[PDB]
Amino acid sequence: VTGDALSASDIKVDVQNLAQGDINELGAKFSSRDDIFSQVDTTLKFYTQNKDYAVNIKAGMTLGDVAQSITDATNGEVMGIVMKTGGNDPYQLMVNTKNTGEDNRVYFGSHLQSTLTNKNALSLGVDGSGKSEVSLNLKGADGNMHEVPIMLELPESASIKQKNTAIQKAMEQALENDPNFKNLIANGDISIDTLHGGESLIINDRRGGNIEVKGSKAKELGFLQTTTQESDLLKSSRTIKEGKLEGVVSLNGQKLNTDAIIQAINAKEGLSAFKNAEGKLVINSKTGMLTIKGEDALGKASLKDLGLNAGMVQSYEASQNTLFMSKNLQKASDSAFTYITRPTNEVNVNITLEQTTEPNKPAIIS
């Protein structure tokens, strides 16, 4: 092998890109690994390797705790690592992938994903009922859901890749042209990336808000799923205990056959509850926030029988802004080269790619 671009175990190899894992900063600066990361229970939501993960975070956890818990939630596929950086509080939480290749980008919050399987022409307009044939429903700068029409008159595409780019542009142009979205696209909270070599689009909202692709023509873009799953705020650890439970407890102040409790909860403004397929109490709040407390000794002692803890719990969405700022430092990406692309640097005639090469001066195995 000539130069320094690869090591093999008369062949000419231009190495354009190397395969990479993802590297992200998540969370604020800390003075110490031991400082408290969050004083509230909450969930860190992200998506990678085609899997949604929800890492539970408990009130009073340390930065060190959260780092490890990311690693433990994912079985080591996503590594929660602490790295010294700059400034007075040096410690910053990093979330880095174990693996290389495009499929390992980490998308925080919510996302919808498409798969185009044809290059047919589409016109995206307005149906005979006056409704957008395709529209994007996202959470706006004001905290309310809004509808962004997506219009597009596109002849047959030469490839699936140029079609998707076009859609991407259309969606990006719409969002940039709407007051409720202009700055969410500028600051990176809302993005629309292409993936799987052009075959797929992914809308991601790092704040975690609902995403919907609506309209008579959503299917034509290839969204199997057209809405993201609003994930529930609080779920008991245990089925509610059988028999006489006693005392008074509060949910955001509001005083109290897990059925009886459900009906009790639903009669309170901005709280909702239901019974799971496992028989468990699930409580929601409009604010994304719950504070559980016992209103008298017996209540204090009965929270465990409802599989609850005295404390505050927050939706990811409710706590994203304070606990979970994210910035990508390096994007997971496939390797790219030519005698061809691949999701790792190990290209098996065995070859490991180590560096890019300069045009007209490639690696020669001989």
Beta-strand level of the residues, as a percent range? 25-35%
Number of domains: 4
CATH-assigned fold name of the largest domain: Immunoglobulin-like
Give the class-level CATH name of the largest domain: Mainly Beta
Strand order of the largest sheet: 26-25-2-28
Fraction of helical residues: 10-25%
- The number of E-state strands comes to 28
Q: Which structural class best describes the helix and strand composition?
A: alpha+beta
| Count of helical regions | 7
From the alpha-carbon coordinates, what is the Rg to the nearest angstrom? Answer: 25 Å
CATH architectural type of the largest domain: Sandwich
Family: Belongs to the FliD family.
Subcellular location: Secreted; Bacterial flagellum
Subunit structure: Homopentamer.
Organism: Helicobacter pylori (strain ATCC 700392 / 26695)
Your description of this structure?
The longest helix is centred in the middle third of the chain and has 18 residues. A hairpin with a 4-residue loop joins strand 14 and strand 15. 31% of the residues are buried. With 366 residues, this protein is of the alpha+beta class. It folds into four domains: 43 residues, no CATH class; 77 residues, no CATH class; 109 residues, Immunoglobulin-like (Sandwich), CATH 2.60.40; 71 residues, no CATH class. It contains seven helices and 28 strands. The strands form nine sheets. Strands 26-25-2-28 form a four-stranded antiparallel beta sheet, with no helix packed on it. It has a four-stranded antiparallel beta sheet with strand order 6-7-3-24, covered by helices on one side. One of its GO terms (biological process) is bacterial-type flagellum-dependent cell motility. Keywords: Bacterial flagellum, Coiled coil, Secreted.
